[PDB]
């Protein structure tokens, strides 16, 4: 039985993108997080406004993001996984922010959200694809009779891990590991590989 | 504005695997396709029987498939497509038979069928994933709010082409083209790129 391997993106294969981008620009106002502004829509509108006040159009943003690299060992891990499973990346970021990083991973299929860009290359809005997108994606693959094995690093990955046939926690905080013991928790790509092997119904080699 | 490019595999990116396997090994009986035998289940039972009678185990089969390559220009086309869309391959091939070719394409997500391999590495059976598999795959992406643009080369791709938001016939036989006038038909990869640009709701460049 061929399985689909669903991987979260940020914190699993690449650094948290917005935060790294903000740090690279040196603009303190771009660094607010959900802790500073809990309402996600309010946080996003602010980000768009500050980006515009500083003249950072999409091209400028992607230029900065292109200097980021996948986490050490992530490139080999994705290659390893693609020799054994059909690989799909699920992410709560936007196509426009992830692109320079996806390129470095060989553009594996990515299901995430999308920014609204005007004719002057300005980021003017955003669109969330649907509610609980990672979980709904797993459901879609189950509709095609696939067994799904998923891996993620945060609480925002737990509905995906719960929906999959097998879930694995990677670099997760103790807060999550303790609450979701049904998911093996590891923090090295080698151990992550081993968990995918144990979760598979097929006999695969390391 | 969220789009998935679904591509058929054989005829579109790589040669028909069985016809090429026959030309390599000299086993003419393996040239048969659904044109010769309409029931994929019967044709499959026959193909497995012949492989066995020729002592061809899975490892042996793959050594041969590894000598095949993608159609001229297909790799470059997939790379072009992956910079602009999320690319998923929909095929009636089998994972174990197509792997060497899929690796050359950078292992993009492949939704196809699987084989039953025994202890002695013999291909003793197969399992078709579900009925009308390509059409159902398109429906699955629709369930995630994606717009789908599909490309295929034959009669067996038409349910997929009709279900998609936009369908393109590529390298299709004249008969298929004539019977399905609703889909633009092109024969070069540059023209295929152009059809993906026309079908997209986004401003993309060639
Ligand atoms: Mg994450
Ligand atoms: Mg993390
Ligand atoms: Mg075909
Ligand atoms: Mg053809």
Swiss-Prot record, chains A, B:
SUPFAM superfamilies linked: HAD-like
Lineage of origin: Bacteria, Pseudomonadati, Pseudomonadota, Gammaproteobacteria, Pseudomonadales
Required co-factors: Mg(2+)
Function: Phosphoserine phosphatase that mediates dephosphorylation of phosphoserine in the serine biosynthesis pathway. Also able to dephosphorylate other substrates such as phospho-L(or D)-threonine, with lower activity. Shows phosphoserine:homoserine phosphotransferase activity by transferring the phosphoryl group to homoserine using phosphoserine as the phosphoryl group donor.
Record-listed Mg(2+) binding positions: 8, 10, 153
GO molecular function, one term: 4-amino-4-deoxychorismate synthase activity
Family membership noted in the UniProt record: Belongs to the thrH family.
Keywords: Amino-acid biosynthesis, Hydrolase, Magnesium, Metal-binding, Serine biosynthesis
CC cofactor note: Binds 1 Mg(2+) ion per subunit.
Name of the top EC class for this enzyme: hydrolase
Pathway field: Amino-acid biosynthesis; L-serine biosynthesis; L-serine from 3-phospho-D-glycerate: step 3/3
Coiled coil: none
Active-site residues, as the UniProt record annotates them: 8 (nucleophile), 10 (proton donor)
GO BP annotations listed: dephosphorylation; L-serine biosynthetic process; tetrahydrofolate biosynthetic process; threonine biosynthetic process
Enzyme Commission code(s) on record: 3.1.3.3
Any one Gene Ontology cellular component term annotated for this protein: cytoplasm
InterPro entries: HAD-like_SerB (IPR050582), HAD-like_sf (IPR036412), HAD_sf (IPR023214), HSK-PSP (IPR011863)
Species assigned in the record: Pseudomonas aeruginosa (strain ATCC 15692 / DSM 22644 / CIP 104116 / JCM 14847 / LMG 12228 / 1C / PRS 101 / PAO1)
Pfam families assigned: Hydrolase
Residues the record lists as binding substrate: 16, 47, 91-92, 134, 156
Name of the gene: thrH
Name of the protein described by the UniProt record: Phosphoserine phosphatase ThrH
Annotated disulfide bonds: none
């Amino acid at each position: 039985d061929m399985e689909i391997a669903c991987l979260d993106l940020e914190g699993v294969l690449v650094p948290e993108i917005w935060i790294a981008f903000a740090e690279k620009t040196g603009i303190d106002a771009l660094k607010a997080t959900t802790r500073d502004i809990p309402d996600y829509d309010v946080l996003m509108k602010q980000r768009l406004r500050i980006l515009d006040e500083h003249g950072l159009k999409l091209g400028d943003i992607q230029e900065v993001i292109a200097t980021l690299k996948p986490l050490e060992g992530a490139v080999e891990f994705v290659d390893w996984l693609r020799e054994r499973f059909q690989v799909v990346i699920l992410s709560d970021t936007f196509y426009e922010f992830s692109q320079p990083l996806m390129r470095q991973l060989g553009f594996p299929t990515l299901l995430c959200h999308k920014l609204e860009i005007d004719d002057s290359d300005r980021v003017v809005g955003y669109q969330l694809r649907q509610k609980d997108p990672k979980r709904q994606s797993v459901i879609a693959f189950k509709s095609l009779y696939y067994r799904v094995i998923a891996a993620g690093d945060s609480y925002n990955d737990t509905t995906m891990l719960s929906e999959a046939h097998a879930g694995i926690l990677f670099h997760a905080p103790e807060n999550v590991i303790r609450e979701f013991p049904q998911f093996p928790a590891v923090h090295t790509y080698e151990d992550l590989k081993r968990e995918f092997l144990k979760a598979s119904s097929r006999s695969l080699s390391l």
